[PDB]
Design a protein around this ligand. Structure first.
Ligand code: X8Z
Ligand code: ZN
Ligand code: ZN
Ligand code: ZN
Length: 232
């Protein structure tokens, strides 16, 4: 029942209810002639909504806000970008123009600026050291260490036992490494083990791209990362 590319036209976003007060958003974009899905998260925060990640670009993110407005009808007051890439901060200007307070760690804000990407306005302190966690309303933000990127954060919704791994966690169907240009291949397995150690009770695990699963997605990603590391 989870939305895949065939169900999402160009420029549109679908929402998927994972648990009470927790949804994923799914959008698509083309890269080198192939179509990729991308996931973000929506977490109910009292009578407001916390958004995790843009929908990968200004068009998709405008569609994201319209679909949230249409389907949930609660204001998106804060957004957190979980790393500096365009599927996470692309669309931050649309969020900002719509009154959403956009947040990212200083590490992500720094890397986004270097890359010429959009820059969330607010800074999330307390996340610069591997193993650091901070509460952000209905979620915990966790910096597990460098993996897919040096700044990647994961998000845990304790009320629903939902772990959102972002692009540091691969879906099961991905059996070879994706974009590792900004990755720390040497530290990625150790970072995944920090996630496993902190959230062993997680019931739902959302990769940045593709189908949700359980905690097996962590070991899966480690397997794929180690196989890529040993490419000969
Ligand atoms: C925009 C995302 C950020 S994790 C990305 O790097 N992608 C998504 C498509 C494949 C790969 C690439 O561009 O190389
Ligand atoms: Zn990325
Ligand atoms: Zn990604
Ligand atoms: Zn696997």
């Amino acid at each position: 029942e989870y939305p895949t590319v065939s169900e999402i036209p160009v420029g549109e976003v679908r929402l998927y209810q994972i648990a009470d007060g927790v949804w994923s958003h799914i959008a698509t974009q083309s890269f080198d002639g192939a179509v990729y899905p991308s996931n973000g998260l929506i977490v109910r925060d009292g009578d407001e909504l916390l958004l995790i990640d843009t929908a990968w670009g200004a068009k998709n993110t405008a569609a994201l806000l319209a679909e949230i407005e249409k389907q949930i009808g609660l204001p998106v007051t804060r957004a957190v970008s979980t790393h500096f890439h365009d599927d996470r901060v692309g669309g931050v200007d649309v969020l900002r123009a719509a009154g959403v307070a956009t947040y990212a760690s200083p590490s992500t804000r720094r890397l986004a600026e270097v890359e010429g990407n959009e820059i969330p306005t607010h800074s999330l302190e307390g996340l610069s050291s591997s193993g650091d966690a901070v509460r952000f309303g209905p979620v915990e933000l966790f910096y597990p260490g460098a993996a897919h990127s040096t700044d990647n954060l994961v998000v845990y919704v304790p009320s629903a036992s939902v772990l959102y791994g972002g692009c540091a966690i691969y879906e099961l169907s991905r059996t070879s490494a994706g974009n590792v240009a900004d990755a720390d291949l040497a530290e990625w397995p150790t970072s995944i083990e920090r996630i496993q150690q902190r959230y062993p009770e997680a019931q739902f695990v959302i990769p940045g791209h593709g189908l949700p699963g359980g905690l097996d997605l962590l070991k899966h990603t480690t397997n794929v990362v180690k196989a890529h590391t040993n490419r000969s």
